Design a protein around this nucleic acid. Structure first.
Ligand SMILES: [Mn+2]
Ligand SMILES: [Mn+2]
Ligand SMILES: [Mn+2]
Ligand SMILES: [Mn+2]
Ligand SMILES: [Mn+2]
Ligand SMILES: [Mn+2]
Ligand SMILES: [Mn+2]
Ligand SMILES: [Mn+2]
Lengths: 136, 135, 135, 136
DNA sequence: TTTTTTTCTGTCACCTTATTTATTAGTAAACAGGAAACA
DNA sequence: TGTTTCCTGTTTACTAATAAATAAGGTGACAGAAAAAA
C-alpha cells in the first residue's frame, strides 16, 4: 500500500528544510489526526528507518538518508515533468502525490529521457506548445 | 471513484470483447474472490450504472456505457504513451493500471496532446533516442 | 426445420429482450427440460449458427442474426394477420407457433400483401366485420 | 395430431372417390410402407371410427363419416383461401397439409368469413391483385 | 402373381437422475483510524 | 504539544448454501425390412 513511503519523504524534506523532525508538523500537512502519525512512526522505527528517544526528536539512519534522497528525486522530477507538459498549477501537486507511488523505477528512468528532451533545447518545447494550443 | 471505475472498466471490456460479462470472469480479470464481485454489482445497480438480475446476469445502462468508453480510452492512451516513451513491455500493464485512476482528466488531455506530438513525425521518435543513447 | 428454427427464433428474441440468453430462460420459453436445450445448443454451435462457451454462454454469428431477424418478422406478420382477421386473442399465439414453421415463404409474402390491403383503409375492416356479424 | 387425422381424411376421400379403400391406396396417399398403415388401422379399430376385417377391408361407421366430411371441408376451404390470395398453384397443397392440423376451428370459421368477403364481390379481388404486383 | 399381416430391429426424441460449476449469503477478523483522555 | 486507552466502522477472504448447466442412462413411439398367410 502507498501510505508507507510518504512519512520517509516528509521526514527527509523536513530535516533538510528546518532540521526539526517532529510529530506535529507532519500531521496537518497530510491532513490526518496526529494519533495515526504517532502509530505509524512507532511502527516503522522498528525497521531501522529512524533514531528515536522518549523525549527527543527523530533522526534518519544511514539507509534512510539515501532512500529519502531517491524519494525527493522522484517527486521533484515528476513536478517539473508535469509543468513541462503544461497542466495547470492547481492540479500538479496532488496528481504527483497520486501517481508517485505506483510508477516502477523503469518508468521513472525512462521519464528522465523525456524531461531532458524538452529542457536542453528551446525549440521542441515551443513545437509542443504549438500543438497544445492548436486543439485547446 | 477508483474502486468502482475498475469494475465499470472491466465489465465494459468483457461486454465489448465477448458480449457477456460473468461474475467468474470479472473475478479473474480483477484477481478477487467472486463474493466481492457480486457484492459490488449489487452496489452498482442502485447507482443505476447496471441492470442486475439475480442468478441471471448484468447489463450496462446508458449512464454506464458513457463512462466505460472514457475509461477504456484513458487505458489505451496511457498504454500508448508509455509505449512511445519506451517502458519495458512487461511493466507497462502493471504501471498503467496503477496510475490511471489518480490522474485528473486535465493531465489526461495534455498527455493526449503529448502522444500526438511524437506520433506526428517519424523523426522525433529517434531524435528522442538520441537523448536516450548518450546516458 | 421446425424443431430447429424455434431455438434460433427464441434466442434472438431473448437477446433483444434481456441482452443475454440463458439456458434456463430458453428452457422456459420452449417449455422443455434444460438438458435438451444444452444438447441443441452444442449442435447449433457445430452448424455455425452461434458461438458456444462451456459454462459461459452464447453469441449469435452473422448467419444466426440474419436468420433470426427474418424468423421474428414472420412471427409478427402472422400475429398481425390473425388479429386483423378477427380471432380471439387467447388462441393467436398457439395458432401462430403451430403454423409458422410449415408455411412457405411465398405464402408469407402473399399474406403480407393481404395484411397491407387491410391496413391501408378503414372501411374494408368494417365490411369484413359486417360479414362476420351475419355469417 | 397430423398422423391421427390424416388417415380418417384419406380413407374418407378414397371411399367417396372409388367406393372402396385398399391398404395400398392409403400407403401411396401418405407415402408410407403399408405395414405402417395396417398397424394404424389396428389403432382405429379400437376407437369405433371404422369396421375392419383381417384380410377384407375397411368401412367407415356413422361416427367416422360425420368427422371425415368436416375435415374435407377444412381442406377445401384452406385450399380455396390460399388460391384466392395468389399463392402459386404448385405450392398450395404442401402448404395446406402443413397447417390444416394446427389451425383451431375458430380460425377456420374466421377464414371462411374472409373467403366470403372476397367471393361476394369481384372488385375486391382486382384491388388485391393490383397491390399484389405494385411492388414486385 | 400380388397384396396384406406378423415379427426384427434399428435409429432416434425426450425426460429422469446425477454430477460439476457458478453464484450468493452470512461470519469473521485484521486495519485504519479516532473520540476522549494527558501534561 | 507528546503521546495512550478503548471504540467503530471498512475491506477483504473463508466457508456454506443455492442454484444453474452438463453428462450418463433409460424408456418407448415410429419407422423401415423381410418373411409369412391369403
Ligand atoms: Mn506520497
Ligand atoms: Mn511525494
Ligand atoms: Mn482501472
Ligand atoms: Mn485501466
Ligand atoms: Mn416458432
Ligand atoms: Mn413464432
Ligand atoms: Mn393432413
Ligand atoms: Mn388435408
Amino acid at each position: 500500500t502507498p501510505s508507507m513511503e510518504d512519512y520517509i519523504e516528509q521526514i527527509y524534506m523536513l530535516i533538510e528544510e528546518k532540521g526539526y523532525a517532529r510529530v506535529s508538523d507532519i500531521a496537518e500537512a497530510l491532513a490526518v489526526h496526529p494519533s495515526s502519525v504517532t502509530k505509524m512512526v512507532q511502527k516503522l522505527d522498528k525497521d531501522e528507518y529512524l533514531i528515536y528517544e522518549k523525549y527527543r526528536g527523530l533522526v534518519l539512519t544511514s539507509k534512510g538518508k539515501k532512500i529519502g534522497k531517491r524519494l525527493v528525486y522522484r517527486h521533484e522530477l515528476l513536478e517539473q515533468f508535469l509543468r513541462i507538459i503544461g497542466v495547470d498549477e492547481e492540479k500538479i501537486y496532488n496528481d504527483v502525490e497520486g501517481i508517485e507511488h505506483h510508477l516502477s523505477w523503469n518508468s521513472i528512468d525512462r521519464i528522465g529521457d523525456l524531461v531532458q528532451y524538452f529542457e536542453e533545447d528551446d525549440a521542441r518545447k515551443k513545437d509542443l506548445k504549438s500543438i497544445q494550443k492548436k486543439t485547446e
